[PDB]
Design a protein around this ligand. Sequence first.
Ligand code: OCI
Ligand code: OCI
Lengths: 304, 304
Amino acid sequence: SGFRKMAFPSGKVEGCMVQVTCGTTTLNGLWLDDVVYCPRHVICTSEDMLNPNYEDLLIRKSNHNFLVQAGNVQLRVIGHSMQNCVLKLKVDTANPKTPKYKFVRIQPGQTFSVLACYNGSPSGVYQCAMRPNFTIKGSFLNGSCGSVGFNIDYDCVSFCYMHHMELPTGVHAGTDLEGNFYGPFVDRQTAQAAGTDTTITVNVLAWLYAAVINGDRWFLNRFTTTLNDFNLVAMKYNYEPLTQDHVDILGPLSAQTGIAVLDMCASLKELLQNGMNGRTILGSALLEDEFTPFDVVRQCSGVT
Amino acid sequence: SGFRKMAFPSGKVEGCMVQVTCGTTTLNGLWLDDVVYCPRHVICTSEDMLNPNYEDLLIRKSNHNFLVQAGNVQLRVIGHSMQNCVLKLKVDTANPKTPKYKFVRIQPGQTFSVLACYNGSPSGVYQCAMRPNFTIKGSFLNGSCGSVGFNIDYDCVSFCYMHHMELPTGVHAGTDLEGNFYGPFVDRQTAQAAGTDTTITVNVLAWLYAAVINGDRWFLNRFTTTLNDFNLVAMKYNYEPLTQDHVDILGPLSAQTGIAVLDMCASLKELLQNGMNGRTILGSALLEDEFTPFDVVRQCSGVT
Ligand SMILES: Cc1ccncc1NC(=O)Cc1cc(Cl)cc(NS(N)(=O)=O)c1
Ligand SMILES: Cc1ccncc1NC(=O)Cc1cc(Cl)cc(NS(N)(=O)=O)c1
């Protein structure tokens, strides 16, 4: 009973967080095995951030300039390198708390948990999605850089995001754990517009199935539609086009509820065309798009 | 930048979760020091749940009947007792992962994180509030009993909730860690109506301050009100009456933003009387009430 925006348990990731200081800048690092990963802008001063030449700035830094602290103890840095927009600090000790892990680059529409950290200390955990414009709508303040996004499959943590910056519009941009930014963003203090933030249609449909499973059914109608007819409606409302791949991924939810995917699309079409008329679905007065079909199956089945 | 429904990092609590089996029933237990806490209905069969005499059922159970497993290893039960609606199983080993902790009984309106668990394994973490009718709107399935709610102050975990049951309306009821139910609920399979679920006014005001801090300001108006005038509006909309204690707790938010509490109440009065007119506040199309003033200060300041 009930349906909530649920994050993964954060313990496996909390044991990887460290504080990295270079010069006068402090941010978060991720310690896995004998490497600490952090945003390369740790080597910058505020004056450098306008037009930084990271390669030239890094020449002036040596291993002893990177101060890595795990809780109360200091890690010894025996190597440093830059991989895209991240620094990899080789330390002399493997993290004993390193979980089984992978580095994954997610697609827009996919969700993940964020463990917001400051000074290497965790402050909170929340669930979010990689938006279609490659931004995330997080909750981050100065010092939160280096906080990571992840998914967990039983015992393996798949790290997908490392926080780097806030855009002038208060949305967030970052990299995968190979240091490649999601979207066209650069790690420079220059105004960068985000792009159209469309609604993740397949996720809205998944959430409507979650609503039916949990009893919220008022939006079910006597209609059906086609992929092309639904997509005309989706275009008008800045919803992502629905493909047969999306319909296929909703299969387990269609099977569990007995509601055909195209019938659920006709429900969504009517909700887009008429609004909610002051009503709510799963405690929300808007159509929620940050639950994937996998998230809905996981939560509705109790996967640990 | 940004404002999210954030839960506490769950690591300290994940290290306390165990699986408790009695007869054919399995649920979650909380292992702190040498005691495992779990809902007493672990001793019941489905047939017992209609009208159980817990004292009589417990007479037929011995220490060896309680199977406690922490991860893959078995804990030895050397004592058992019932405290209100919880069982306390004394084990021969102290939990090495026991964090600094306290047991607290929260007031309605207060928020906490829930670490949903199944078979002693964590599945997810989410933030919720103790509703004014003493129910919680969680996300729990069969096997989730014994999952706990908590708050964290630096290194100390304050456990406030242990999950016991779902009401026929799909809302959730449970106890504090002394085994006393929140509200009038009993651990018996008998239909128990919840009570009016009013809106936590002080929390809505806190969230409106969070919205102003993060840039959502369209709802600020040229009006003011009084506590008695606002409370006439709050009564009409099933909002909790606002007291001077609530106004006092909003003081830090009033000080940070420069918006007097009664001016923010006039904004809330107009939102109640006119609705949002298709607009949103912090990504929501309804007035959010599961952020306390302390939660807003914590998130907006970055407390770890
Ligand atoms: C203050 C803060 C809040 C949340 N998350 C992160 C931060 N910190 C930053 O964004 C620092 C930073 C780094 C880079 Cl690579 C670029 C900028 N560009 S800007 N935002 O237009 O000035 C700023
Ligand atoms: C199935 C489930 C889902 C979520 N959370 C918990 C559960 N399990 C339960 O509630 C079992 C249980 C225990 C008690 Cl003490 C009473 C009842 N009464 S009822 N709901 O009206 O049948 C049921």
